[PDB]
Amino acid sequence: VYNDGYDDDNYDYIVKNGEKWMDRYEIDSLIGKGSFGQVVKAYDRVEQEWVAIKIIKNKKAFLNQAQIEVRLLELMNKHDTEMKYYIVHLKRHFMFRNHLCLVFEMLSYNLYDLLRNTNFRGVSLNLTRKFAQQMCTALLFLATPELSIIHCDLKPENILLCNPKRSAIKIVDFGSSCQLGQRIYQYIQSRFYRSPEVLLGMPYDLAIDMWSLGCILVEMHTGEPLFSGANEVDQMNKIVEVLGIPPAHILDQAPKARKFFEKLPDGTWNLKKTKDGKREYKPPGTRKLHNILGVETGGPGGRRAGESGHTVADYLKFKDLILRMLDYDPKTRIQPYYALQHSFFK
Numbered sequence: 258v259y260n261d262g263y264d265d266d267n268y269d270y271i272v273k274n275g276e277k278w279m280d281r282y283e284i285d286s287l288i289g290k291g292s293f294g295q296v297v298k299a300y301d302r303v304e305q306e307w308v309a310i311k312i313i314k315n316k317k318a319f320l321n322q323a324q325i326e327v328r329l330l331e332l333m334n335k336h337d338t339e340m341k342y343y344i345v346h347l348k349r350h351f352m353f354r355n356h357l358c359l360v361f362e363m364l365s366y367n368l369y370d371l372l373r374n375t376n377f378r379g380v381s382l383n384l385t386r387k388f389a390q391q392m393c394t395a396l397l398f399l400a401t402p403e404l405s406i407i408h409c410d411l412k413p414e415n416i417l418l419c420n421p422k423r424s425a426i427k428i429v430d431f432g433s434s435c436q437l438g439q440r441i442y443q444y445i446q447s448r449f450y451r452s453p454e455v456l457l458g459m460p461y462d463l464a465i466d467m468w469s470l471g472c473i474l475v476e477m478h479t480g481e482p483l484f485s486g487a488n489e490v491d492q493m494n495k496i497v498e499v500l501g502i503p504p505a506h507i508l509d510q511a512p513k514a515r516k517f518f519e520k521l522p523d524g525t526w527n528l529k530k531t532k533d534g535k536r537e538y539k540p541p542g543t544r545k546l547h548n549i550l551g552v553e554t555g556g557p558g559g560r561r562a563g564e565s566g567h568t569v570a571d572y573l574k575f576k577d578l579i580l581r582m583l584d585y586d587p588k589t590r591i592q593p594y595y596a597l598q599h600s601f602f603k
């Protein structure tokens with residue numbers, strides 16, 4: 258009784274291995290499920306190639322959002338820049354049995370899958386560098402004036418390997434993305450990678466992606482997330498643990514500022530008083546990124562100690578660029594063009 262027997266009770270098209278669609282697509286198997294719906298592996302009998310079909314849920318709310326996602330992907334293809342090689346390519350889309358389907362290029366595993374293969378010990382600084390450089394290029398593509406696309410959900414699971422034996426990557430899942438101004442949501446990023454301006458309920462631009470990328474690169478080398486917030490309040494505190502109290506000029510304009518801080522008569526800002534009055538966090542700015550990365554002590558947990566490619570100078574450059582991506586001020590946060598000119602990329 259769900260789409261004449263084609264959908265389950267959760268608005269998802271029941272994937273039948275071996276089904277042939279529109280005499281063109283030979284569906285192989287289901288790759289995985291997400292909030293939007295499902296992604297399946299399929300062969301295009303026409304192009305004689307493998308593709309990944311993103312099947313949106315048969316529900317108005319999910320359809321209306323995937324329409325924005327399509328227009329954003331089509332607008333990206335209208336700009337034949339080399340930089341969109343770090344964005345996944347949408348080949349075509351169609352409606353099949355009341356489902357909007359997006360035909361993407363076939364890719365490999367996501368960066369979180371990669372971290373799991375290292376037992377979350379992390380990948381090398383050289384690999385992290387290559388991930389960083391491709392990602393800043395992708396962020397610079399979206400920063401193009403005619404585009405001005407905020408991704409809004411950058412996270413390791415949204416960065417895919419083109420091939421499991423190489424370092425090339427592509428950003429996927431633009432389902433939460435918007436163009437500047439046309440921002441429609443206030444609760445947009447994944448907690449672990451949520452920018453302080455979003456946490457504080459302030460206006461946001463394309464810089465929120467840069468913040469997420471900074472959190473991604475640190476996790477890609479250490480293997481564990483930089484800010485493991487169990488909720489919005491725990492998230493904002495774990496950031497303060499590393500970067501200190503947000504500057505007074507940002508907190509003076511944050512609608513949600515009193516969710517995490519209180520203004521002392523001094524004219525200064527400080528964390529709220531936990532009800533229990535107990536210690537759950539380190540004092541602000543006392544959990545140093547210097548020691549998180551193991552700059553002078555052999556890398557994250559001393560794992561890279563005595564190994565090529567992880568010199569003290571290499572970490573000093575890495576820590577500097579990361580601290581520029583983790584700038585509280587979205588207007589001073591390093592932007593993709595100048596991030597690419599950072600000495601960390603030599």
Ligand SMILES: O=C(O)c1ccc2c(c1)nc(Nc1cccc(Cl)c1)c1ccncc12
Pocket residue numbers: 288289290291294295296309311345361362363364365417429430431
């Ligand atoms: O959203 C996109 O733009 C998007 C675009 C391409 C892929 C994708 C998502 N997700 C994939 N895999 C995947 C893995 C787990 C769960 C889900 Cl739902 C999907 C995948 C695999 C291979 N090649 C391309 C893709």
